[PDB]
Design a protein around this ligand. Structure first.
Ligand SMILES: *[C@@H]1O[C@H](CO)[C@@H](O[C@@H]2O[C@H](CO)[C@@H](O)[C@H](O)[C@H]2NC(C)=O)[C@H](O)[C@H]1NC(C)=O
Length: 1003
C-alpha cells in the first residue's frame, strides 16, 4: 500500500527530460482523502500538451490537451461529497483523443480533445500533490496544492509505466521530494479562521515572492463598511513625480473595503488601477471567497467565483514587493513603511475588523491562527463567532453619540457632541482664538492624500474667518474650511483653481456647529450639523494633496499667497482629521509637534480692545468693501450716551453710519433709495460700561439685520445695484468740521468715546491703530488705561526699571535678588563648616570668550579670607577672574593676558554677618567694583592691555580649589547672563555640587 500525507506546502517532482513522455494512449489511477474543496492531485507538461487532475470546488476536475484544444471535465459529487475525508478512486483512460474519467468506479464522463492532435508530448516535469505555481501550470482550474492523503498513484502508457506512489517511497534519483516529507495515512488536518477584533489589529506575513505571476486566496466576513484587508509595497523609486517629488513612490498592491465595497488596488511601475471587485456591498456578515491571480500586467480578482479582469497601465510586468506583507491593517509609526495615496483606507486609518480564514500564497496554505496569532498579536482571537445581540442596545454611546453596530463591537461617532473616546465619555478640549491666535500641527513628515475625513465644531460671532487649513511649505495647495458670509465654505485647490462647496446660513450665531468634510478623490462632501449634505465633483484631474501642516486660527504658512482668509475669532473643538483629534492630542501632550498661542478652555472673547480716549478721537481706515453683502461685527463699551462710531460715504448720497444715540444703537444708511434708520433693539441705554455685541448685516436679498447682544431686528429694503463706497472708513468719529453736514437722519454731533473690539468689517480685521491711514486724538491699546510707567521707587534693590509696551519691568541681573520687583531673595546657598563647592562647567564648544564681563552676587560672612567665586579659562591659558575677600574687604582680581589687575573695596565692612551685594564690571583692562551703595570704584590701567577673557571653562563657587573655603551664605550669583545658583537649584547637568553646602527654601 502506497499512502502518503500531503502537508499542503509539499509536492512530488519527476524529471522527464532523460526520457520524454509522448503518447497516443495512456491511463491514470489513484485514490484520495481530503477535507478541502480544492487541490491539485497531478499535472504534467507545458505549452499546449498537458494533463491536469485536481479537485475544483468539491468536484473532480480533469483537463487534457494534446496540442489542439483541451477536453475539460468536472465529475459531480453524486450522493454526498468528495471532500468528505474519505477514500475515492479515480481512473482516467485515454485512447487517442478520447477520454473517460471514472470516480470510485461507475461515475463516468466521456468526451474528446479538440481538432486533430493525438500526441501528448511533455519532456519537462511531472507534478503530484502540488507545484511551484499551480494557478500557473496550463489547464489548471485550481491554484492550490493538495491537503490530505493521496494513494496508489500511476501513469501507465503504452511504453513506460511511471508508478509515482512507489518511486517516491522506495527512492529514485529522478524523484525530487520538494519540501516537508510524510509517508503514512490516518492523519487529519484543519486550520483555524481568525477574528480581527480591533481596526489596528493586524498580522504580519511571509514575503509575497511573486514576480511575473502570483496568486492569493482567502475568505472574509464582516459587517464593517471600511477596512484595509491586505497590503504590501516595494522599495522606493528613483523615477519621481513631477508635482510631488517629496512623495515616495512604490510598487504596491492592496485589497480594501470602502462602504461595503471590495476593492483591488495595484501599481507595478506606471499608474495605479482600482477595481470594484463586485457590484454588491459585501459587509453582509456573510463569508466570501477571494481569489487574486496575476500574470504580469494583468489578472483577475474573484469574489465567490465571479472573476473580474484588470489590466494595469504601462508595460511594467513585475510587481516587485520585497519584505513584509500585511493582513487586516498596518503598524503605526513603522520605519520604512510608505502609504500610497491611492489606498484610501490606509491614510484614513480604517484598519480591518472582521473575520478571515484559509489563506493561500501562490497556492500554498497559510495558518493565520499561529502566524503571529501564537505570536502575541493584540486584537486577534482564535475562532470566529457572530454575537447575536445587537451591540447598540447595550446603548453604549453617551451624550447623543451616533451608534453603529460593528462586527463584535459597537462604534460611536462622537463628532457632533463635544466628546470623544470609545463611548463619548471624554469631554473634548476647547481652544479659544481672539483674532491673533493660531494652533498649527506640524506633521513629523510631509503628508500626501487623495482622501480625507475632516470634522470640527466651531462657534463664532463673525461671518468670516478661517476654520482649518492644510498647508504645504512648497506650494499654495490646500484643503480649507472657512466662514464666508455666515456660511461654511470648503475649498480644495490643487493648483488648478479653487473647487468649492458652501453649506449653512447665519452660522455666526455664537452657537456650536459641527462641520464634517469627506473628500474621496474628486468627490467632495460637506455637511453642517444635521442638514442635507452638499456634494460636488472637482473639475481638473489633480487629486493628490500635499501638506506639512494643519492650521487653525491664522493661516501662517502662506508663502505663495499674497492674501488669505482672515483670522478666526471664536472657539473650536473636536478638530478631527483622518481620526486624529489634534486639539486633544495637543492639550494632553500625546504629540510634541503642535505649536500654538491660542488658549485652552472656553471664555467670552474681546479681540484687540482699543480705547478712543476722547469723543473727538478717531481713526480713518481703507474704505469698507461691501460689494455683494455686508457683515459688520464689533463690540463696544462706553459711558457716553451719544457718539458716531462708524461712517463711510459713497458716490451720490450713498453712505453707511453706525452711531449711539441716547444710549441706543442706530444703523443709518442710504443705498440709493434714500436714508434709512434701523434701531438696534435693547430695553436699556447701552452706555452701562459693559461690553455689547453689535452685528449688522445686509444680505444679497437686501434683508438688513441688526443684532444687539441677543436680539435680532430685521428689515427689508429696496433692490438696488450695490455700489462701492468712496471715502475712507471712519471709526470713533469724523473730523470736527464734518459733523455739520452729516447725512439726513444721523444725529451725531460728536464722535465715540469708549472701547471698540472685535471689529470685523465685512471680512477684514483691521488693527485700528496700526492700519490707520490717519488718526486724530488719542487711541490707546487695551481697555484699561495706560501701562504702568517707571518711577524712582519702582524696582527695589538697585534693580533697573525698563519700559515695555505693557508696563514697566525690572532687570534684577546686577542685584542679588529676583522676582518682578527685585524684591524677593535670589537663590541662596549656605556654605557651612568644612568647605563646599558648586562648579559650573561649560560644554567644551560653548566656552565663552568675552571682552566685557559683569558679575553680581549677594553674600554674608564673618571670614577674613575667602574665595567666593572664580572663573577660569581652560587647561593652558592664564586668564581668570576671581572674587575674593582679603583682610575683611571684598575684591576682584583678574587676568586676561597682560598682568593681574586688582580692584578692592577698601572701606566697607563686609565680614560682618549682614547681607551685602557686590557688582563687578570689566571692559578689557578697565574695571569697576561696587559694594552695596558705596561709590563705584574705577580702575583704568595704562599700557598694552589685552582685552579678551579667552575660552572660559569653569565657574567655581566656594573657594575650596583655591585653598580658601568660603563659609556663610551666597545668594543670587549672576555672571554674564548666567544665574549660576538658580541653575544649580534646578539641577542643570553642567553643575557639580560637592561638600557642605545647602540650598535654602524660599517663602
Ligand atoms: C579704558 O579707559 C580709557 C580711559 O577713559 C578709555 O580710553 C578713552 O576713551 C575715550 C572715549 O570713549 C576716548 O575718546 C579717549 O581718547 C580715551 N582716553 C584715553 C586716555 O585713552 C578706554 O577706551 C578704555 N578701554 C576699554 C577696553 O574699555
Amino acid at each position: 500500500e502506497y499512502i502518503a500525507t500531503f502537508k499542503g506546502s509539499e509536492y512530488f517532482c519527476y524529471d522527464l527530460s532523460q526520457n520524454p513522455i509522448q503518447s497516443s494512449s495512456d491511463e491514470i489511477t489513484l485514490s484520495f482523502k481530503t477535507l478541502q474543496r480544492n487541490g491539485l492531485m497531478l499535472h504534467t507538461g507545458k505549452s499546449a500538451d498537458y494533463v491536469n487532475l485536481a479537485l475544483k470546488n468539491g468536484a473532480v476536475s480533469l483537463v487534457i490537451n494534446l496540442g489542439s484544444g483541451a477536453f475539460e471535465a468536472l465529475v459531480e459529487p453524486v450522493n454526498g461529497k468528495f471532500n468528505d475525508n474519505a477514500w475515492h478512486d479515480v481512473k482516467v483512460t485515454r485512447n487517442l483523443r478520447q477520454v473517460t474519467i471514472s470516480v470510485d468506479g461507475i461515475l463516468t464522463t466521456t468526451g474528446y480533445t479538440q481538432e486533430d492532435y493525438t500526441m501528448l508530448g511533455s519532456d519537462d516535469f511531472f507534478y503530484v500533490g502540488g507545484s511551484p505555481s499551480t494557478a500557473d501550470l496550463p489547464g489548471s482550474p485550481v491554484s492550490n496544492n493538495f491537503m490530505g492523503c493521496l494513494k496508489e498513484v500511476v501513469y501507465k502508457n503504452n511504453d513506460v509505466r511511471l508508478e509515482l506512489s512507489r518511486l517516491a517511497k522506495q527512492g529514485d534519483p529522478k524523484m525530487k521530494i520538494h519540501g516537508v516529507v510524510a509517508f503514512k495515512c490516518e492523519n487529519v488536518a484543519t486550520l483555524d479562521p481568525i477574528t480581527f477584533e480591533t481596526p489596528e489589529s493586524f498580522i504580519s506575513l511571509p514575503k509575497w515572492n511573486a514576480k511575473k505571476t502570483g496568486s492569493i486566496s482567502f475568505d472574509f466576513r464582516t459587517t464593517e463598511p471600511n477596512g484595509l484587508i491586505l497590503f504590501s509595497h516595494g522599495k522606493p523609486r528613483h523615477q519621481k513625480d513631477a508635482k510631488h517629488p517629496q512623495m515616495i513612490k512604490v510598487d504596491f498592491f492592496a485589497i480594501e473595503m470602502l462602504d461595503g465595497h471590495l476593492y483591488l488596488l495595484l501599481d507595478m511601475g506606471s499608474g495605479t488601477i482600482k477595481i470594484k471587485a463586485l457590484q454588491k456591498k459585501v459587509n453582509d456578515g456573510e463569508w466570501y471567497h477571494v481569489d487574486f491571480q496575476r500574470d504580469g500586467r494583468s489578472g483577475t480578482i474573484s469574489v465567490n467565483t465571479l472573476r473580474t479582469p484588470y489590466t494595469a497601465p504601462g508595460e511594467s510586468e513585475i510587481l516587485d514587493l520585497d519584505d513584509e506583507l500585511y493582513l487586516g491593517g498596518l503598524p503605526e509609526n513603522k520605519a520604512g513603511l510608505v502609504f500610497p495615496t491611492e489606498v484610501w483606507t490606509a491614510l484614513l486609518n480604517y484598519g480591518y475588523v472582521g473575520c478571515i480564514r484559509d489563506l493561500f500564497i501562490d497556492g500554498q496554505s497559510k495558518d493565520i491562527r499561529q502566524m503571529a496569532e501564537v505570536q502575541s498579536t493584540a486584537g486577534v482571537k482564535p475562532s470566529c463567532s457572530r454575537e447575536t445581540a445587537k451591540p447598540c442596545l447595550s446603548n453604549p454611546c453617551k451624550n447623543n453619540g451616533m451608534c453603529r453596530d460593528g462586527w463584535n463591537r459597537y462604534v460611536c461617532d462622537c463628532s457632533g457632541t463635544g466628546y470623544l473616546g470609545r463611548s463619548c465619555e471624554r469631554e473634548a478640549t476647547v481652544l479659544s482664538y481672539d483674532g491673533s491666535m493660531f494652533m498649527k500641527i506640524q506633521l513629523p513628515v510631509v503628508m500626501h492624500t487623495e482622501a480625507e475625513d475632516v470634522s470640527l465644531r466651531f462657534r463664532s460671532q463673525r461671518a468670516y474667518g478661517i476654520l482649518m487649513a492644510t498647508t504645504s511649505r512648497d506650494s499654495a495647495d490646500t484643503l480649507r474650511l472657512e466662514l464666508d458670509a455666515g456660511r461654511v465654505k470648503l475649498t480644495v485647490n490643487l493648483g488648478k483653481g479653487p473647487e468649492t462647496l458652501f453649506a449653512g446660513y447665519n452660522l455666526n450665531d455664537n452657537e456650536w456647529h459641527t462641520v464634517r468634510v469627506v473628500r474621496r478623490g474628486k468627490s467632495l462632501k460637506l455637511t453642517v450639523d444635521d442638514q442635507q449634505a452638499m456634494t460636488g465633483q472637482m473639475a481638473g484631474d489633480h487629486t493628490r494633496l500635499e501638506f506639512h501642516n494643519i492650521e487653525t486660527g491664522i493661516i501662517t504658512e502662506r508663502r505663495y499667497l499674497s492674501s488669505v482668509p482672515s483670522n478666526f475669532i471664536g472657539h473650536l473643538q473636536s478638530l478631527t482629521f483622518n481620526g486624529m483629534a489634534y486639539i486633544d492630542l495637543c492639550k494632553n501632550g500625546d504629540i510634541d509637534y503642535c505649536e500654538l498661542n491660542a488658549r485652552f478652555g472656553f471664555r467670552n472673547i474681546i479681540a484687540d480692545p482699543v480705547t478712543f480716549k476722547t469723543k473727538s478721537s478717531y481713526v480713518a481706515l481703507a474704505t469698507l468693501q461691501a460689494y455683494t453683502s455686508m457683515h459688520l461685527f464689533f463690540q463696544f463699551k462706553t459711558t457716553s450716551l451719544d457718539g458716531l462710531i462708524l461712517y463711510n460715504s459713497g458716490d451720490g448720497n450713498d453712505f453707511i453710519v453706525v452711531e449711539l444715540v441716547k444710549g441706543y444703537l442706530h444703523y443709518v444708511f442710504d443705498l440709493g433709495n434714500g436714508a434709512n434708520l434701523i434701531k438696534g433693539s435693547s430695553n436699556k441705554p447701552l452706555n452701562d460700561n459693559q461690553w455689547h455685541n453689535v452685528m449688522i448685516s445686509r444680505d444679497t436679498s437686501n434683508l438688513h439685520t441688526v443684532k444687539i447682544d441677543t436680539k435680532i431686528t430685521t428689515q427689508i429694503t429696496a433692490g438696488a445695484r450695490n455700489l462701492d463706497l468712496k471715502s475712507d472708513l471712519y471709526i470713533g468719529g469724523v473730523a470736527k468740521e464734518t459733523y455739520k453736514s452729516l447725512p439726513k437722519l444721523v444725529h451725531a454731533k460728536e464722535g465715540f468715546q469708549g472701547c471698540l473690539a472685535s471689529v470685523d468689517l465685512n471680512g477684514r480685521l483691521p488693527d485700528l491703530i496700526s492700519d490707520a491711514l490717519f488718526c486724530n486724538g488719542q487711541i490707546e491699546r487695551g481697555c484699561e488705561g495706560p501701562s504702568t510707567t517707571c518711577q524712582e521707587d519702582s524696582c527695589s534693590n538697585q534693580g533697573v526699571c525698563l519700559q515695555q509696551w505693557d508696563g514697566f519691568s525690572c532687570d534684577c541681573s546686577m542685584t542679588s535678588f529676583s522676582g518682578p520687583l527685585c524684591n524677593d531673595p535670589g537663590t541662596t546657598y549656605i556654605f557651612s563648616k568644612g568647605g563646599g563647592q558648586i562648579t559650573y562647567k561649560w560644554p567644551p564648544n560653548d566656552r565663552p570668550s568675552t571682552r566685557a564681563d559683569r558679575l553680581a552676587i549677594g553674600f554674608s560672612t564673618v571670614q577674613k579670607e575667602a574665595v567666593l567665586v572664580r572663573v577660569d579659562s581652560s587647561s593652558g591659558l592664564g586668564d581668570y577672574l576671581e572674587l575674593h575677600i582679603h583682610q575683611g574687604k571684598i575684591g576682584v582680581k583678574f587676568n586676561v593676558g597682560t598682568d593681574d589687575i586688582a580692584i578692592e573695596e577698601s572701606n566697607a565692612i563686609i565680614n560682618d554677618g549682614k547681607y551685602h551685594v557686590v557688582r563687578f564690571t570689566r571692559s578689557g583692562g578697565n574695571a569697576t567694583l561696587q559694594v552695596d551703595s558705596w561709590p563705584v570704584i574705577e580702575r583704568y590701567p595704562a599700557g598694552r592691555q589685552l582685552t579678551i577673557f579667552n575660552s572660559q571653562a569653569t565657574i567655581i563657587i566656594g573657594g575650596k580649589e583655591q585653598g580658601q573655603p568660603f563659609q556663610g551664605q551666597l545668594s543670587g550669583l549672576y555672571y554674564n547672563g548666567l544665574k549660576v545658583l538658580n541653575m544649580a537649584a534646578e539641577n542643570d547637568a553642567n553643575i557639580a555640587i560637592v561638600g557642605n553646602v545647602r540650598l535654602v527654601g524660599e517663602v
